[model samples]
Structure formats: structure tokens, C-alpha cells
Target: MISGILASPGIAFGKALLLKEDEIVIDRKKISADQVDQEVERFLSGRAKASAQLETIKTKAGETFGEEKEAIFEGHIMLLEDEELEQEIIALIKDKHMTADAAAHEVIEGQASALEELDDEYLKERAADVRDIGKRLLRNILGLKIIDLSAIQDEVILVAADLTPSETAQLNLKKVLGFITDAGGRTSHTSIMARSLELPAIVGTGSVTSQVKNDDYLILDAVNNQVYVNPTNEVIDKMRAVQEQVASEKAELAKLKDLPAITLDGHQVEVCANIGTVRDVEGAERNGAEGVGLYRTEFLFMDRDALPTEEEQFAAYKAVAEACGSQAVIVRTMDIGGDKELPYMNFPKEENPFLGWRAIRIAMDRREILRDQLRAILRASAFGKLRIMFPMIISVEEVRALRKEIEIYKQELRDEGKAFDESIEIGVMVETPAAATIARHLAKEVDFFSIGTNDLTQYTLAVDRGNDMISHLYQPMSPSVLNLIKQVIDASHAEGKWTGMCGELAGDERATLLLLGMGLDEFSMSAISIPRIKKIIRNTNFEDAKVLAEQALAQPTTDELMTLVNKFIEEKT
Candidate 1:
């Protein structure tokens, strides 16, 4: 058995299917001046074909995995049509007398290498995207079959060096039981897609492609991060037993779908889902979320050539609001820049993007963008409950400014005789240390506070979560981080304003009791986590949880804190 990073959790058994990368041998022979027009036409037609294919895949992905996931392909299509990149590729063919395929290859490689050299992890990953598109474009030019993966006839466990976003999108889910790869971490685009599709996957297994052969019976236990190859009958039986146990546990969780996430001692809390698109709202409902704690508006701004208009933003927001009915949907303004960049926006490269201009900073500088979004959200509020929140806010002054901006839009709508929720609540995301420290000051300005622990941990600990070398130091449960979280909750309560946690910690069962005891008004996470968290809440006494939080907060180190919390958890079991 071999181990790898668990990208998505599930169990599967199928025959191995090795997917070797298709090599394209480009013809480097120089073309004559007369052949330039024909070669350019060839390149353009291939580009068009690749663009059309991506569009079709994007639509299918949208329907299968929801619109947010489809944004991956949307970004791919954008790269395919990038004017600057296009001009360079054409210039190489027309001016340099290079073959169309060779020109395309050189330009794409140059663009990819430029991105790969960047310090940003997200941008570095884009290098793979550029190459993926390059391969697609070259394949079209070479008259290669683009849909080879779609022709599989039997269920198999896909083994590959890596799966690109385009290749992953083309996976025949019915025929592919699961997949194990030689490359990719949990945050890779392929891994994200695996989780979105609920497909079992184990990625970053260094040499799985070399070890596995076609038709080899394989058992992939993603939950355990293990891949068993050609196991004996006894081992197969054991794996099957574990699979049954998993199914039973899932069945038990499904039974809690109609129940409330209330503590045993009568203390109740709101359980909501953090979503990206309107289709995600349906998944939230399936997981029995009471409301949407986060509606990321960044996806609306991304995957397009230009900024979305007020009407376009309004229509999207309205759909989510109406779908939720009276359930509160907290709409976070576009938190663009940093890890997420728009090619058209042409943002300057930053040394530390996480600490630089992003989220609220961008919104403040681009007033019209924020204004249009605020107006759209306010107009949607008339249909159902919708609250507005700002991200990456470090000062109370920023909150006040944003609130004033909201009021300006509200007045404009009122002047135009349009309907809206006049008393719609505004909230602040306490993700930065400055925001956490001045929670009391900010609480007085906003209706509520939602602690974004992902950034809160990053800022408080001064550790980049994306940096693999120091990931061990990026602990959110550390004493310093927990103290700030408790501080935010206390400050919000003092002002009679409730606090919620929308970060990854909110979904963690280990942190559930501690957060509950700290009086977190809402717990929002991915839909899949709701049942397990709700189950834990339903089983524990709020008073006991309070004691656990007290002991946990008093611990000097994260190691000690987790020790105490784990002991408390074991005692409950």
C-alpha cells in the first residue's frame, strides 16, 4: 500500500487505468512569407476550436459542479482569448517566420514560465493552466482527438502523473470510479474539482503512475490517504467492511437532516453554509443549513472580460435571495486581487499580496465597482433577506466608510422609487489583527461580526498559510489566535451584536464546542460539514462546552490547548 495526500474522502475499488500524457512533436521548420497567412489562419482556427471546446466544457461543469467551479474553465477561456498573448503568438508566426505550432508553443511556454517565476503560489499554479491551454491549442492544430478520456467503457481508477483542469473536466464520472495522481496538493484546482464532484481521490502520490498498470485491481481509501494495489481476498474483505461502516455513518448523518443544531442544554446556534454561487444554495439546503453565512461575490467579478454591470450583479444576487426566501444570506463584497487576479484588471505585482491591497482596499479605491455591487445587493434585498459584509477590513474607519457608501446607494434607490430592505444589516469580517483588536469599536458600527479565521490566523501568527515550509506554524487553534477569536466574540456581545465564524475552523468538529461556548451566533462552512458539526452540538452540553473553552483558552501553547480539548472530547465519547 502507498500513501498520498487526501484530496477528497471516500472509498472505491476498480481496475487501474493509466493515463499517459500525450506528447506533441512540434514542426519547427520555418514557413515562407506566402505560407504566413495560411499558418496564421490555421492558428486562429485552432484557437477558436479550443475556445469553443472550453465553453462547452464550462457549461457542462456548471451544470454538474455549479457555476463557481465552472469559473475554472471560464478563466481558461479568458487565457485562450487574451489579446496580448494572442498578439504575441501571431507576431511570432508572421514576423519571425516560425511555424504556427512552434510559435504557439514558444509563446505559451514563455507566458507560463513568467507566471511560474512569481512568488505567489496561486500565480505559480496558473503556469499549469497556461500549459494546459497550450496543449489543447496544439492538439487542435495537430488534428489529435481532444476527447480521448470520454471514450472509456468500464469503471476504472484513473492513474496519471497529474490531471489538468481540462482533462479532469472531461472525466466520465459514470465510468471513472475514482482517481489517484502523482502530483497535486489539496488546494490544487484538480483537487478542488474532485471535492466539488464528490469523487474519491488521493493526489500527490509521488510515483503512483509508475507503480500502477492497466487492469490492476486497486482499492483507494481516500479517507485514510491510502491506495492498496492488487490486494489479497482477505484485504479486499477488510476494505469492504470499512466501506460498509462508512456508508452506515453517512446514513446516520443523513437522518439528522431535519433536526436543529441545538446543544443538549438548550443553547441554540445558527448553522449556515458558505457559498459562492446560486446553485450552491441548493447544496446548502440539502445539508440542512438554516441560512447562508457567506455568499462570496468574487466569482461574479471573475471569469469575465469586463466588470459586471449593476443589472447583471443584481440578477445573480436576486436569484440567491429569492431561493433562500427569508433565510439570511450574507453577501460579501468582491474580495478580488491577492491570490485571485483579473487579467483585464492589470493589478500591479506585490511582494506580499496577502498583506497588500485586496478585498476592501480594492473596493475602496474602485468606488463605482463597490457602488454597483452595493446597489445590486440592496435591490435584491427587497425579494428576501440579504445582509452585506466587507472583507479584509483592518480599521473601524474603513467599516464606517463602507457603511456610508451603502447608505449612499440606499438613498439613490429610494430617490428612484425602487423597493429594498431599508433596514438591511451590514457586517464586518474580523479577519485581520487590527480588526480583532478593535472589534468593540467596529461592533458599534456594524450589525454583526463574522470572524474569518483563515486570514485571522495568517495575520495574527504572521505565517503564510500557503507557504508549505511554515505551514506547521499557521495554527488557528493556537492560544494567540483563540484569544483573538474569543475577544471578537466578547466585543460583539458587549455591543449586543452577534458574532459568527465563516472560516475553516467553523466546520471543524474539534473547534465546535469551543466556538459554541464562546457564544458564536453562527457557524458557517461547506455544506458537507453541517451534519457532523450539528451532531456534535446536539450531543454536548453547552455548560460543559463552556468549561472546555475556558481550559482551552488558558493553555499557553497550541499543543497543550489541543491536548485538553482532545481529552475533553474523548471523555464525552
Candidate 2:
């Protein structure tokens, strides 16, 4: 058995179908200057064909994969239509007098190589996408076609050095049991795809391409982070038995519907869900969510070519409101930039994209888009329980600026006699150190504070959470992160406002008890995680956990804090 990071959960046993030996080589030659126009048309035509292909995939995969999976193809489609990137390729032909296929190969290869130099495995993995699109354009120029994965008749575990998101999207999920890669991570395209399919996967294995062969029987025990190669019958039987056991356990947990997530001491903390689409509401309701915590409104703006109309935005928000009914749904404004990019929108290049103009900065600067979204949210508010939250606030001035826009929206609503919740609460995400430090002052300006620990921890330590080289340094359990969270929670409470965590930390079973101890008023995470958190709250004494958090805060390091937290869980066991 070999080991690697677990990318997704499930037990998958299938024959390995090695996919590394079939790379299509690009033959490049300098074409005459007169043919430059022809090259451009070829590139455009190829892009159009690729987009049509993606549309077909999206439409067919829609029923099976849901909108989130469809959005992956949407992102690829936008990448294909990116004018700036096309301009770059065209410049090489115009200025450097290069051939279309050769220019595209060089420009696209440069993009991939540049990203590969970065520390973040996720960003580095994007090189696959650049290469994927590059190859498609070149193939169309050269009159070539892609291999067929849909025709594979036998069940197999696909293996490769690395796989592109586009390539993964074309997979036959019924025949492809699982996958293993020599390189990838949680943010890798393959990882995201695997999560959507609920397919067991192991990535960043480094030498799986060299070690495994075609037709090799493999046991991908992703839950345990192990891969058993050509295992004995005894081991295979044991794996299957454990898989059945896990399935049975999940069935038991599934029965925890509509249950209250209250503590043994009767501290009634709210358990909510962080959802991407309105379709997630049913799952959230099933998992005992009392409210919607982080309604990521970014996806609406992301999937299309043009900014959505005010009415279109309102209808989607209205659907969410009506679906969740009286549950407090906190809708975040469009958070563009960072890892998420727009093809039509030309954002300037940055040395670091994460800390650059994103969330509130993007919205407040581009008021028209923000106005449309805010107007839609306000209009949708009358349909159900609604609250609006802005993202990536670095200063009080940002919040103060947003408040000005809030007034404009309200005035517009009043002018048109539009029905809305006049009392709709507004808040900002407390993720940056600036916001946390001034949370006391900022708390008074907003109705509530939701701490986004994901970015907070990344910024606090000045560690790029995307970089695997320093991922360990990006510790949420560290004293610095814990203290910052405690400070924000206290600052919010001081102003008689509630504070909640709407990040990965909120879903961690390890930190749930401690967060409860710190008086975290609301817990927002994925729907599947809600029942486990509910069970934890129902079993724990909140006061005792609160004392446990005090002990945790006193610790000097994350290791020390984790030791105490682990010991407590051991006692509970």
C-alpha cells in the first residue's frame, strides 16, 4: 500500500487505465505574414468549436452533475473566449512574425510555465488548463481530433502524470471508477471534479505514473489516504467490508433531519449552511440547517458572458428566498478577482492576486454591477428572510463607502415603491487583520459580523495558503489565528452584535468544540457537515467547551493547542 493526500472520500477498486503515453506533439513552423489573418480566423474558429463542445457537455451533464459541475465548463468556455489572451497570441504573430500554431504553443506554454513556478499547487495546476485550451486551438489549426473516453467499455481507474479539467469533464463517470495522479491538490481541477462526482481520488503521489501499469488492479481507499496495488484477496475483501460499514454509518447519519443543534447546557447556537446555488437548499434543510450562512452570489456573475440583468438576478435570489422560506439567508455580494477571473472584464495583472482588488473593492469601484446585485437582493428580500453581507473589507472606510451605496439602493427602492424588507441587516466579512483590529468600531456600523477565517489565517501569517511549501505555516489553530478570531467574536459581542465563522475552520470537527467555547453564535459549513456538527453540539456541554477554549487560547502554539483539543476528544470517546 502506498500513501498520499486524500483528495476525496470513497472506496474505489478498478483496473488502472494508464493515460500518460499518448501526448499529441505540436509541429510548429513560421508561416508567411500574409497568412496571419488566416491563422487568427483558425484560432477563432477552433475556440468557437471548443465552446460549442463545452455547451453540449454542460447540457448533457446538467441533470447528472448539477450546476456547480456545469460551472466548471462555463469557466473553461470563458477562458476560451478571453480577448486579452487572444490579443497576446495575435501580438506574437503581428510583432514577432511567428506561425499561428507555433505562436499559440509558445504563448500558452509560457502561461503554464509561469504558473508552474508558483508555490501554490492549485495555481500551478492551472497550467493544465492553459495547455488544454492551447492544444485545442492548435489541433483545430492542424485539423486534428481528441481521443474518445466515452467509448471505453470497461470500468477503470484512470492514471496520469496530470489531467486537465477539460479532459476530466469528458470522463465517463459510470465506467471510470476513480483516478490517481502524479501531481495535484485540493484546489487542483481534478480534485474539484472528483468532489462533485464523489469519486475516490489520490493526488500528488509524485511517482504513480512510474510505479503503476495498465490493467493493474488497484484499491483506492481515499478515506484512509492509501492506495493498495494488486492487493491480496484478503485485503480486497477487508476493503469492501469497510466500505459497506461506512455506507451503513452514512445511512444512520442521514436520519438526523430537522434536529436541533443545541448543546447539552441548552446554549442554542445557530447551525447554518454555506451554499453555491438554490438547489443546495433542499440538502441544507435535510442536514438540519436553521439558516443559510454564506450564499455565494459570485457564481451567478461567473457563468455568463454578460453581467446579469437586474430582473434576472432578482429571480434567482427570489428562488433562493422562497426555497429556504423563513431561514435567515445571508447573501454575499459578487466577490470577483483572486483565483476567480472574468474573460470579459479586464483586471490588471497583480504580483499577488489574492490581496489585490477583490470582493468589496471590485463592487464598490464597479458600482453598476454592485447596484444591480444589491437591488436584486433587496427586491428578493420581501419573498423570504434575507440579510446582505459584503466581502473582503480591509477598512472602516470600505464599509462606510458601502453604506453610501446602501442608501442609494434604498432610495431607489422607495422611489419605485418596491416591496422589500426595510429592516434588512447589512454586515461585512471580518477576514483581514485591519477589520479584526477595528472590529469594535466597525461592529457599531453593521448589524452583524461573519468571520471568514480562510483568508484571515492566510493574511495574518503572510502565508499564501495556496502554496504547499508553507501550507503548514497557514495554521488556523495557531495562537495568532485563534486570538484574532476571539478578538473579532468579542468585538462583535461587545456591540451586542452576533459573530459567526463562515470558513473551512467552521466545518473542522477538531475545532468545533473550541469555537463553541469561544461563543461563536452561528456555525456555517457544507450541508453534509451539518449533522456531524449538530451531533457534536448535542453531545457537548457548552460551558465546559467554553472553558476548554480558554485553555486552548492560553497555549503558545498550534501543536500545544491541538494536543489539548485532541485530549478532550479522547476523553469524550
Candidate 3:
């Protein structure tokens, strides 16, 4: 038996199907100037062929999964059709006289890396889509055969180094019971796909591909993060029981869909969900989310050539508010700029984009952008409970300016005779250390605080979370981050304002009790994680969790704090 990171939770017993990737070698030999035209034409035709292939895959995805999943392939087809990308590759081939494969590789890798450097999780995940399209385009250029997993004739558990988004989309759910990979994180394409498909998956085992063979009986217990290869009969029986238990446990969680996330000791905190689009509200509601803590309005601003009109934005926000009824929906202003550049808005490139002109800074510079969004959000507020929040705030001055700007919009709407919520709330996303440092002052300016731990941890540790080499150092549970969180919560409470968390850490089951003890007023995360965290809160005693928080804060290092937390969790169990 071997252990791996539990990317998706479930259990499956099946035969192993090893999937080895076909490596496409790129020849970089410079060609004559006369050959440039031919190479460019080769790339163009290959791109067209790739587009056709994606269309086929898109149809299959819609039939197998749903329209939402099918949109991934549709986006891929759009990427293939991106004229900017085509122009870049053509320029490389014509200017440098490089081979079609080599030029395409360079351009695609560059584009993907640019996206990977962004702070947004959604955009960062798109890097996989870009690379997947590159693979298809390159294969078409070289006439290489694309492996079709749907062609498999037997039921099995897939083992691979890693599966691209396109490859995961192509999987035949009838034949593939589950999957294990040598590399990937919970947010990787394969892991996300597995969860959506409701398949058990374990990733980052480092040797899962090399350790297994085709037709070997395998037991994938993703709930326990364990994989057994060709196990004995006794082990098979035990695993089958585990698999049954997993299904029963899910059914039990479904029973919690309407229950409050209240502690055994009577401490009740709001449990919300972070969403990017209006369609996400359905899943959030299904998982018993009481509200929408972080409605990333950036989705409205991205993947398009033009900014959304006031009416367009209002319609989206109004639909979300109407769907939630009285449930509060905090719509964050467009966190664009940096790597999330719109094709129409030619933002100047920066040396350090994450810290440069991005988020609120971009909105501040382009007042019209924020004006339109605020007007739209205010207009939508009339339908139901809708709140506005600004991102990347570093000072009280910014908050004051934002509040003042909202007043202008409110007055404008009043004079125009357009109805809106007169007492709509305003807040700021505490993502910078500067914001945390003056949380006391900022709390008085805004109605509430939502800690964006993804950027907060990155800024506190000075470690880029995406950098694989330094990923080990990116610790959100460190004493420094924990102290800031405590300070933010305490400050908000002092002003009679609530504090919520809408970051990756908020969803983590390990940190649920800790945050609850820290007096975190609201917990917002992905929809699927809501049930698990709610169950933990329901089972935990408030006093015990509070004591654990005190002990955790006293720890000197992240590792020691993690050990203490793990020990406390074990004791609870």
C-alpha cells in the first residue's frame, strides 16, 4: 500500500490502466528565409485541424458531463482561434526562421507561464487549457496520434504522470472508475475534473505511474489517501466495505444541507461560498451556503474583448441577488490588471505585476470602470441583498476614497429616479499586510472584512505560491499569518463589524476549527467544501476549539503549529 495526497474523496476497486504520455520532440534547427512561409502555413492548418478536434471533444463533453463542463472545450476552441497567439507564433517563425513545432512551443509556453504568474486561481488554472491546446496543435503539426481514453474496452483505474484538461475531458466515465497520478495538486486539472465527475482520485504520489501495471487489481481509497496494488482477498473485502461507507457518509452530509453550522457549545458562524459566476450560486445553495462571501466579478470582465456595459453587469448581479433572495451577496469589484489584461484594455506591462497596477489600483486609475460596476451593483441591490467590496486595498485612504465614490453613485441614481438599496453595505478585501496592519482604522470605514488568505499568505511569507521551488515555504498557518488573522477579527469585533474569510484556507478542513476559535464570523469557500466544514463545526466544541487556537498562536513556527493542530484534531477524533 502507498499513500498520496487526497485530491478527490471516494473509494474504488478496479484494474489499473497505465497511461504513458507520448513525448513530442521539437527540432529547433533554423530554416532558410524562404521556408518561413511554408512553416507558418503548416502552423495555420494545424491550428485549424486542432479547432475541429476540439469541436468534436466539446460535443462529447456536453453529452457526457453538462454544458458547463463542455464550455471548457469551447474555450479551448476559442484559444485556438486567438489571433494574437497565432500572430506571435507566426512572428517567431518568420523573424527567427524557426521550425513550426519549435516556434509554437516557445509561444505557447510563454503564454501559459504568463497566466501561471497571476494571483487569480481561476486564471492560473487556465494555464493548463492553454498547454492542452498547444499539445493538440503541436501533434497536428507533426502528424502524431492522440491517445483516446474513450476507446478503452474495460473498466479500470487510470494511472498517469498527469492528465491535461483536454485528456481528462475525454475520459470515458463508464470505463474509468478512478485515477491516480504521479504529479498534481488539489486545484490541478485532473483533480478538479475528478471531483466534478465524482471519481476517486489520488495525486502527487511521485511514483504512481512507475509502480503500477495494466490489469493489476488496485484499490483507490482517496478518502484515506491510500492505494493498494494487487491486495489480498481480505483487503479487498475491507475496501469494499470502505467504499460502501463512503457513499453512506455522502448521503449523511446531504442531510446537513439545511442545517446551521453551529458548534456543539452553541457558537454559530455564517457559512458562505465564494463564487465566480451566477451559475455557481446553484451549487453553493445546494451545499447549504447561507450567503455569497466573495462574488468574483472579474469573470464578467475577462475572456472578452470589451468591458461589460452597465446594463450587462446589472443583469448578472441582479440574477444572482434574485436567486439568493435575502441572502447577502458581496460582489468584489473587478480584480483585473497585472496578468489578467483584457485584449481591448491595453494595460502597460509591469516588472512585478502582482504588486504593481492591479486590482483596486487599476479601478482607481480608471474611475469609469469602478463607476460603471458600482452603478450596476447598486442597481442590482434593489432586487435583493447585495453588498460591494473592493480588492487589493492597502490603506484607510483607499477605503475612504472608495466610500466617497459610492456616495456619488448613490446620489446619481437617486436623482436619476432609478431605485436601489439606500443602505447597501461596503467593505474591503484584506489581502495585503498593509491592510492588516491598520485593520482597526479600516474596520470603521467598511461594514465588514473578508480576509483573502491566498494573497495575504503570499505577501507575509514573500513566497510566490505558484513557484514550485518555494511552494514548501508558502505556509498560511504560520504564526505571522495567524496573528494577522486574529488581529483582523478582533478589530472588526471592536467596531461591531463582522469578519469573514474567502480564501483557500477557509475551505481547508484542518483550519476550520482554528478559524472558528479565532472568532472568524464567516467561513466562505468552494461549494463542495461547505458540507465537510459544516460537519466539523457541528461536531466541535467552541471552548475546546478556542483553547486550541490559543495554543496554536503561541507556536513559534508553522511546522510546530501544524503538529499541535494535528494532535488536537486526533484527540477530538
Candidate 4:
């Protein structure tokens, strides 16, 4: 037996099955021209059958699981109606006079090849989506059904090249102990779903497919990012012990679900939720969130043909604020443009979307959109504690301009005898390198600073997270990124304003400890990740966290920083 770690960053272990040299088979048959035509006709017919079968399942599932699950099934039904993909494949078949099967094959091959050639990691991850959908369609034409792994008796770890949102949703999560994919970025749907399900998953393993075999006895070590395949008896025994440790830890975490997040020194930190929609509000309350730290208002303006009216925005914002009750809710103004494309917004695409015209910069340029969102937030403030925030504020001048706009809007509302909260706090998101560097000055102008670590890490590292080649460099705990975060926190404190973090890093178990040490007053993350972060916060004193932070800052690498911090955490127990 041989042991090796896959290229992925998480742990996955299972029983190992090695293939004999001759037993390993590769399918390389080329489809003939005649076969292609026959396949296309069969493919279209199969889609119709699948649609009928889905409708019947939807009716049954809806009765059993409720409307949400039914709606999810409806989305899968719409995948057949994907006009863009259908048109492309049909054009290829007609124009090239190719067989239906060959045309479908070509379309799938072309998309995969194109995505593979792209340097962007996010785009490259989409290659998995392309392949999954392409193969599903091909399988449909061939009259093959998806393998029902739910029937498998033993707890099996799922191994796939990639998984689509629908496929991940359809998984029998109870039977599937964990997941390992050969291709996917950190922000891929699979990763997000795994977090939501609290299932361990590892992606971006280029060799995982080749290395892992069916029924292989393996051990997934997510914390260490290693997979021990066909481990020695000692290793298996060690893993079994680790599994018990995890179970005990989980039980402890469950006990803290209703507890407040207070440090050993008696400092209380607000554990908040970052919400994008009204539906997310319930999750916050259920997860013991103090309030909504960052409500991304851009979703209202996205995926639509026209800008949402002020009344429409007011209703949505009001609903969310009311849902959270007396807890303070911070709503970010329309921070759209750049990478987020809205059909109505006619901003031309730029080479660098993140740095280009976006967020506060563009909203300031188009004052009307900015004012509309501010008015909505202000109007909704009467419903609860609503604090207005601006995104991507790179300069003090931009904050001044935004304040001026808010003042003007408040006056307009006053003139109209509108009942809105004029006393609502105004804040800005510290996402840019410039914002972090000049946070002290900006802090004086704003009430608080919310550090969006996602963008801050991207900009500070000068890495486009969407690009795969540089993704390995997108380290949240890098010296440069941590230094910037510390600078921002220090600046915010110096000016007597509180600092908060609302990003992927904010919820991370390891990163959360570091941020607590850096003196972050608030933490905003997904609802499910809240309890774990809260547990970490309760485990240490404010002074001890500061010491850890000091030591972490002196470390040469992120790995070193993590090792030191984790060792301390373990010793604390």
C-alpha cells in the first residue's frame, strides 16, 4: 500500500482499490457522422422524457419536502430550457451538417477546451460545470441514469471530477460522508454547499482522480489538508481517535449555540450575519446573530432589466430590518457596476473589473442611484436600527462626497415630510489597499469601518481571485494582507470607531482567532459558520489573543503563523 496527499487543500479518506495495469480502461472512440445525427434526435427526445419525469418527481417531493425543495427541482427543469446552450449546439449541428451526437460532443469539447485554456481560476472552475452538464446531456441521449449512490450501504466518500449546484443538491448527504473533487476553486458551488451542509470537502486536486480508487480505505484530514490512503493500522487507529475528538468538539459547539460571544477578559463581540436577501434574515436570528453587519443591497439591482424603484427598495430593506428586530442592521448602498453586470446598467466592460469603475466610485459619479439606495435605507431605518454603509471607498474625498449626498437626500426627505431616521450611522467598507492605508483619516469621517477581507486580500496581494494561476497566492494570512488588516484595525481604533470584518476569512476557524487577537469588534459570516466562530471567541482572553496576534505577525509565513496559533489553541484545552 502507498500513501500520498492529493493536490486539494482539504482531507478525504476512504478504503482504497488499486487498479491493475490492464484493468484500467480509457474510452477514446470517436463518434461517426451517421452516429452524430442519430444521437441528436435521441438527445432531444430524452430531454422531453426527463422533463416529464422531473415534473412527476416535483409533485411528489413538494408534498414530502415542501415548496423550497420543489422550487429547486423546477430550476433543474429549466436547465433543459437553457436557450443559449441549446442555440449554440443547434447552430453547430445545422451549420456544420454534423450528427446530433457529434454536435453535442463538439459543443462540450469546445467549452471544456476553452475553459481549460483560460488563466482565471474561477473561469477554469466553470469547466467542471461545462463538463458535468455536457456529460449529463450525453448520458441522457444514451439512455443512462445518474448513479444512485444513496443506495450504497456503507458511508462512502464521493469522488467526482466536479459537481454542479443541482448535483450537489441532489446528493444523499447522510450516506455521503464527504466529498473530493479533481477541479473546483475555493468559492465554487461545491465548497459553499459543503459549508452549508457542514460536510468536509476538498477541491482543486489535479491528481485526486488518478490517485483515488473506488472502495479505497482512506482518511480525510481536512485540518491538515491530507488524505491518508490505505493507511497503516497505526494511522487508522489514530484517525479513529481523531474522529472521537471531532465528535466531542461538535457536542461542545452545540452547547454554545445560545451563548453570547464574550471573551475571558469580559469583552463582548457582536456576532453578526452578512445577508444578501430577505430569506437570509431568518437564518441570522436562528443562529443567534446580534444583527446584520453587512446587507448587500446590490442584489435588488442585479439580474433585472431596470433599476428597482425607491419604494421597491424600501419594502425589501424594511422587511429585513424588521426581521432582525431591535438589533442594529447595517445596509450597504448600491455598490454595483464592475464585475456585477446589470442589464440596465450600460457600463462598458473593463479589463480589470475590481479596480475599474465600481462601488462608491461609480455610485458617486451617478449620484441618483446612490441617493435612491440611501433614501431606501434611511426610510427603512424607522423599522429598526439601520446603519448605512458605502463600499469600495478608496479615499477620504469619496467619503466626504458620499456624506454630502446623504445630507442632501435627508434634506429632500425632510422637505417632503418623509418619516426617516436622520440619526442613522454612516460607515464605509475598507476593501482597497488605499482604504486600509488611510483608514485612520477615513474613520474620523465615518462612524465605523467594516473590513471586507475578500477584496482587501485580493487587492493587497495584487491577485485576481478569478484567475487560477495566481489563486495559490491568494493567501488571507499573508504578511502583507495581515499587515493591512492590522493597520486598518489600528486606524479605526485610533479614531474611536469600531472595526468589523465581513468576508470568507471572517468565518474561518483559524483566521477568526487571528482577527480576534487583532482587536476586531465584530464578526460577520454565513449563518452556519457563526456558532463555530462564537465558540472560538469564547475560548480565549482579549490579552491572550493580542499575544497570539503579536507572535503571528512575527512569523515568516502563513503556515508558521497557523501552526503557532493552533498549537496555542490546543494547549488551552
Q: Which candidate is the best by TM-score?
A: 1
In model 1, which regions exceed 4 Å deviation?
22-147, 257-259, 303-306
TM value for model 2:
0.76
Show pairs that collide, candidate 2: 517-546
Error of 1 at 60 (Å): 15
Whole-model lDDT values for every prediction: 0.85, 0.82, 0.85, 0.76
User: Which predicted model would earn the best lDDT?
Assistant: 1
Error (Å) of candidate 1 at residue 383 is 1.0
lDDT by residue for model 3 (215-301), tens: 788887776777777778887788889989988987887875455889988999998999878878888888899999999998667
Q: What RMSD, rounded to one decimal, does every model reach?
A: 10.2, 11.5, 11.0, 10.2
Clashing pairs in 1: none
Candidate order by TM-score, highest to lowest? 1, 2, 3, 4
- Cα lDDT, model 4, residue 16: 37
Alpha carbon deviation, residue 419, candidate 4 (Å): 1.7
Model 1, range 113-224, lDDT digits (tens) per residue? 8888899999888788778888778888876655468757577778888787678666788898887787748756677767767778877898988987677888877667
* Shift of residue 275 alpha carbon in model 2, Å: 1.4
TM-score of each: 0.78, 0.76, 0.70, 0.66
Give the per-residue lDDT digits (tens) of candidate 2, residues 318-341.
999999987889999888777776
- Off-target runs (Cα >4 Å) in candidate 4 are 1-183, 197-251, 257-259, 299-306, 337-347, 551-567, 570-573
